[PDB]
Symmetry: C2
Subunit: 32 residues, 2 copies
Protein backbone atom coordinates (compact mmCIF):
# COMPACT_ATOMS: atom_id res chain seq x y z
CA UNK A 1 0.00 0.00 0.00
CA UNK A 2 2.87 2.35 0.80
CA UNK A 3 4.48 1.88 -2.60
CA UNK A 4 1.18 2.43 -4.41
CA UNK A 5 0.74 5.69 -2.49
CA UNK A 6 4.31 6.62 -3.29
CA UNK A 7 3.70 5.94 -7.00
CA UNK A 8 0.61 8.18 -6.90
CA UNK A 9 2.58 11.04 -5.35
CA UNK A 10 5.18 10.73 -8.13
CA UNK A 11 2.54 10.62 -10.88
CA UNK A 12 0.65 13.62 -9.42
CA UNK A 13 3.87 15.63 -9.06
CA UNK A 14 4.78 14.90 -12.69
CA UNK A 15 1.30 15.87 -13.76
CA UNK A 16 1.64 19.02 -11.64
CA UNK A 17 4.87 20.06 -13.34
CA UNK A 18 3.30 19.64 -16.78
CA UNK A 19 0.38 21.81 -15.70
CA UNK A 20 2.80 24.44 -14.31
CA UNK A 21 4.67 24.54 -17.61
CA UNK A 22 1.41 24.82 -19.52
CA UNK A 23 0.22 27.72 -17.31
CA UNK A 24 3.55 29.58 -17.73
CA UNK A 25 3.33 29.17 -21.50
CA UNK A 26 -0.23 30.47 -21.61
CA UNK A 27 0.71 33.52 -19.53
CA UNK A 28 3.37 34.44 -22.11
CA UNK A 29 0.60 34.21 -24.71
CA UNK A 30 -1.79 36.67 -23.01
CA UNK A 31 0.81 39.02 -21.54
CA UNK A 32 0.14 38.38 -17.85
CA UNK B 1 3.72 7.12 6.93
CA UNK B 2 0.56 6.00 5.17
CA UNK B 3 -1.32 8.99 6.55
CA UNK B 4 1.29 11.53 5.45
CA UNK B 5 1.45 9.99 1.99
CA UNK B 6 -2.37 9.95 1.79
CA UNK B 7 -2.25 13.60 2.81
CA UNK B 8 0.34 14.46 0.10
CA UNK B 9 -1.76 12.75 -2.57
CA UNK B 10 -4.78 14.84 -1.58
CA UNK B 11 -2.75 18.05 -1.31
CA UNK B 12 -1.37 17.39 -4.88
CA UNK B 13 -4.76 16.42 -6.36
CA UNK B 14 -5.97 19.81 -5.15
CA UNK B 15 -3.10 21.81 -6.68
CA UNK B 16 -3.62 19.92 -9.93
CA UNK B 17 -7.35 20.78 -9.96
CA UNK B 18 -6.44 24.40 -9.30
CA UNK B 19 -3.89 24.27 -12.14
CA UNK B 20 -6.38 22.72 -14.53
CA UNK B 21 -8.69 25.65 -13.74
CA UNK B 22 -5.93 28.19 -14.51
CA UNK B 23 -5.13 26.49 -17.81
CA UNK B 24 -8.84 26.59 -18.72
CA UNK B 25 -9.13 30.25 -17.69
CA UNK B 26 -6.02 31.35 -19.57
CA UNK B 27 -7.28 29.51 -22.66
CA UNK B 28 -10.57 31.45 -22.50
CA UNK B 29 -8.56 34.66 -22.25
CA UNK B 30 -6.28 33.79 -25.14
CA UNK B 31 -9.35 33.25 -27.31
Amino acid sequence: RLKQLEXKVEXLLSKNYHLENEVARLKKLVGE
